[PDB]
C-alpha cells in the first residue's frame, strides 16, 4: 500500500523530538502494517538528513507519499494526533488510527516505553541539543542492526551515543527485522552511506558516525574477493602461470569487470540483497583463494583471525601460496 | 584520456573567481583537447554545487579529481599538492591561448570584467551564476532566452559572454558525454527543491523545464490526441501495427524511470525510437485530432515528410464530429 513519510514545517526541536518518538512507536507497535513501519522508519532517518528529504519524491510513480506537511502533534502526551495542513489529504479516521498505533507497544517493553530509562520520553525537548543527542543516539542504534556483536559498548565509550537514550533489546530487534524486510528502507540508507563517504560533512557528527558504520556495511561479503585480489594477484607471482589457475584468473577478470560495471551498487550488494553478491564468493575461485590465504598467512600479521575452516579450502594450494611468498 | 577536475582548499571568493576564469579560458583555448575542456567545464559547474563535488569524488558512471588547490595561481599557473612542473606551465599557456574572434583577448563582452577585484562573495556568485546560466541555455534543443534571463535578473549583463564564447561552450557540452552525465544530476536536484529556491538551483530548475523530455513531443502528442480519445477509428487495421509499437515505447519509458526525461541530454540510443517516423499513421491521426480540438496546435509545422495527408483528414473528421 502507501508508504507514509511525515515531514515538518518547523525547525522546532520539541516537534522534531515528538515526531521522532511518534514514528519510533509506530515501528515498534503490534498492530502496524509493514507499510506503516517502512514510512515511520524513513521519517526517523530523514530528520537529520536534508539529502534523504530531497530523495523522497512522489513525482515519478510514487509508492511513497509525503503525506505533505504536519504542523504539530496533539498537545497532551498520549495524544499522538497529527495536525496536517491544507492539501494534506488525511482523514480524521487516520489520525485516530495513527494515535492508537503509537500507544500499542508490546508488553516486553518495560514501563510502556522503547527506552531502558523510563523517564526519557517525559523529558522536555526544549533545546536542539537534547533532540540532536537523542536523534543521533537512536538512529545510531538502528544503523548497527542494519548490518549483516556489541558495538554499542564501543560507540558509548568513544564518540557519543548517550546511554540515557539506549533502546531496550526488544526494540532493537524489531527495528532490525523491519529494516531487513524493508527493501525500500535499505534503498534510502544507501544514499546516506554514499553521502557519508563523499564528505562535505567532515565536521558533521552524524555523518561521521554513519561513515564509520558504513565501513562495516560497504563491501560486506566481499572480503574473500578483495583479499584474493590483494595477495594472489597484487603482485606478479611466477606461480600465477600454473595452468590450474588459468580458469580462475579469467573468472576473477570477469568478477572485477563486474565490480566496475555496477558502479556504486557494487558497494552495497549485501545491503540491497543483490543476486550478484554470491558471484564474488570464494567458492567460485577456491584455488586462488587458497593460494591467496597462504600468501597472506606469511605476509600479514593480522590474518591469524580469518582462516577458519572453509569447505572449499584446498590446503595444498595454501602451502603453494605460503612457499611463494616465503622468500622474496 | 584523463579528465582533471580542479578542487580548491579554501572558500575565499578571490580564489573561486580566479579558478572559474581560468577554467573558462581552457574551455575556449585554441590548443586544449576535449579532455582538458571537459574537466575545466566540470570545475566551473561544480563551484556553486556542493552536490556535484560530491559526485566528482572518484565517481561517477575516468575522472581523476586533480583538486589539491592550495592553491592560488601565482599569476595564471597553479600550485598543486598533486602534480608536475610541465603541466603547470602548459595549463598556464592554454589559459592565454584565446582565439582572435574574442575582442580584447577576453571571453566577456566587457573588456574590464576579468580585471575586477573579486573581493566579496556576492560579486563572485553573481559572476558565477551569470556565466553558468549562459552555459545551461546552450546545452539543449540562443535567440531570445538571454533577453528573458536578462530582464528576470538571472544573467547580470555585466558578465555576458561574447557570442563566439557561447558557441564554443555549446559544442564542448555537445561533445562531452561525461559533462552531460553530471548535468543530469544537477537537473535532478534542481527539481525536488533546494533551500527555499536556492538562487542557482531555482534557475537550473527553470532551465530544466526546457531540457526535460526534449524530442518526445510527437510521442506525447500522439499519446494524448490519438490514444487519449479512444475513438472507434483507432480500430482500423492500418493502426494495428503502430498500436503495439506505441505500447512497447510506453513500456520502454516506464522501464527507464528517472533517465526517461533525459534521453536527449544523455545521448540515449533509445531517443529516436520515440520519433514520430516510427508511427506516421497514428501521428498524422493525432495531428488531425489536435488541429480541431486544441487552439495551440495551429499553426504547427505539419511539414514532416512522413505525414500522411489522408490520415490527417480522418483525424480531423473523427474529432470534429462531437455532435
Amino acid at each position: 500500500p502507501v508508504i507514509r513519510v511525515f515531514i515538518l514545517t518547523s525547525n522546532n526541536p520539541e516537534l522534531r523530538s515528538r515526531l521522532l518518538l511518534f514514528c519510533l512507536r509506530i515501528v515498534l507497535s503490534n498492530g502496524a502494517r509493514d507499510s506503516h513501519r517502512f514510512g515511520a522508519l524513513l521519517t526517523m532517518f530523514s530528520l537529520p538528513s536534508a539529502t534523504m528529504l530531497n530523495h523522497v519524491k512522489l513525482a515519478d510513480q510514487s509508492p511513497e507519499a509525503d503525506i505533505e506537511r504536519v504542523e504539530i502533534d496533539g498537545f497532551e502526551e498520549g495524544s499522538f494526533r497529527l495536525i496536517p495542513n491544507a492539501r494534506s489529504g488525511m482523514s480524521r479516521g487516520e489520525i485516530n488510527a495513527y494515535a492508537a498505533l503509537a500507544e500499542d507497544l508490546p508488553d516486553t517493553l518495560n514501563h510502556a516505553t522503547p527506552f531502558v530509562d523510563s523517564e526519557v520520553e517525559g523529558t522536555a525537548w526544549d533545546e536542539i541539543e537534547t533532540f540532536l543527542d537523542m536523534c543521533y543516539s537512536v538512529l545510531m542504534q538502528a544503523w548497527i542492526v542494519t548490518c549483516k556483536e556489541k558495538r554499542l559498548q564501543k560507540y558509548r565509550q568513544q564518540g557519543r551515543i548517550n546511554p540515557r537514550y539506549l533502546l531496550q533489546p526488544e526494540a532493537r530487534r524489531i527495528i532490525q527485522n523491519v529494516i531487513r524486510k524493508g527493501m525500500v528502507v535499505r534503498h534510502f540508507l544507501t544514499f546516506e552511506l554514499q553521502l557519508a563517504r563523499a564528505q562535505s560533512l567532515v565536521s558533521n557528527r552524524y555523518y561521521a558516525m554513519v561513515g564509520d558504520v558504513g565501513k562495516y556495511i560497504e563491501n560486506c561479503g566481499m572480503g574473500g574477493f578483495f583479499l584474493t585480489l590483494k595477495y594472489a594477484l597484487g603482485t606478479r607471482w611466477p606461480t600465477l602461470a600454473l595452468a590450474a589457475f588459468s580458469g580462475e584468473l579469467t573468472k576473477l577478470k570477469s568478477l572485477m569487470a563486474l565490480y566496475q560495471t555496477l558502479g556504486e551498487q557494487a558497494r552495497y550488494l549485501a545491503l540491497l540483497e543483490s543476486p550478484h553478491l554470491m558471484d564474488f564468493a570464494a567458492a567460485n575461485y577456491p584455488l586462488l583463494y587458497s593460494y591467496a590465504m597462504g600468501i597472506g598467512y606469511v605476509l600479514d600479521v593480522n590474518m591469524r583471525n580469518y582462516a577458519f575452516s572453509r569447505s572449499y579450502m584446498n590446503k595444498t594450494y595454501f602451502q603453494l601460496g605460503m612457499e611463494t611468498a616465503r622468500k622474496q | 584520456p584523463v579528465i582533471r577536475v580542479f578542487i580548491l582548499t579554501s572558500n575565499n571568493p578571490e580564489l573561486r573567481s580566479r579558478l572559474l576564469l581560468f577554467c573558462l579560458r581552457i574551455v575556449l583555448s585554441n590548443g586544449a583537447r576535449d579532455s582538458h575542456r571537459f574537466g575545466a567545464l566540470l570545475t566551473m559547474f561544480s563551484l556553486p554545487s556542493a552536490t556535484m563535488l560530491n559526485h566528482v569524488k572518484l565517481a561517477d558512471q575516468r575522472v581523476e579529481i586533480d583538486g589539491f588547490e592550495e592553491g592560488s595561481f601565482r599569476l595564471i599557473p597553479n600550485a598543486r599538492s598533486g602534480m608536475s612542473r610541465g603541466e603547470i606551465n602548459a595549463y598556464a599557456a592554454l589559459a592565454e591561448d584565446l582565439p582572435d574572434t574574442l575582442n580584447h583577448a577576453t571571453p566577456f563582452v566587457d573588456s574590464e570584467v576579468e580585471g575586477t577585484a573579486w573581493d566579496e562573495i556576492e560579486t563572485f556568485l553573481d559572476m558565477c551564476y551569470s556565466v553558468l546560466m549562459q552555459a545551461w541555455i546552450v546545452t539543449c534543443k540562443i535567440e531570445k532566452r538571454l533577453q528573458k534571463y536578462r530582464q528576470q535578473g538571472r544573467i547580470n549583463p555585466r558578465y555576458l559572454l561574447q557570442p563566439e564564447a557561447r558557441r564554443i561552450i555549446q559544442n564542448v557540452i555537445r561533445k562531452g558525454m561525461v559533462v552531460r552525465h553530471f548535468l543530469t544530476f544537477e537537473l535532478q536536484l534542481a527539481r525536488a527543491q533546494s533551500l527555499v529556491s536556492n538562487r542557482y538551483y531555482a534557475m537550473v530548475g527553470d532551465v530544466g523545464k526546457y531540457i526535460e523530455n526534449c524530442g518526445m513531443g510527437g510521442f506525447f502528442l500522439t499519446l494524448k490526441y490519438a490514444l487519449g480519445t479512444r475513438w472507434p477509428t483507432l480500430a482500423l487495421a492500418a493502426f494495428s501495427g503502430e498500436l503495439t509499437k506505441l505500447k512497447s515505447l510506453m513500456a520502454l519509458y516506464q522501464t527507464l524511470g528517472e533517465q526517461a526525461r533525459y534521453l536527449a541530454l544523455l545521448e540515449s540510443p533509445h531517443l529516436m525510437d520515440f520519433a514520430a517516423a516510427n508511427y506516421p499513421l497514428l501521428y498524422s491521426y493525432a495531428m488531425g485530432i489536435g488541429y480541431v480540438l486544441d487552439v495551440n496546435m495551429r499553426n504547427y509545422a505539419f511539414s514532416r515528410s512522413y505525414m500522411n495527408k489522408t490520415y490527417f483528414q480522418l483525424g480531423m473528421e473523427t474529432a470534429r464530429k462531437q455532435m
Binding site: - | E212, M216, F220, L227, S240, T244, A251, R261
Partner: peptide, 19 residues
Amino acid sequence: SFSPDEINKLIETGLNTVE
C-alpha cells in the same frame, strides 16, 4: 509543453483496441 506526470500512458487504450 507537458507536465512531469504521465497519466497519458493509456496502455488500456492500446490493449482494448487490439482485441
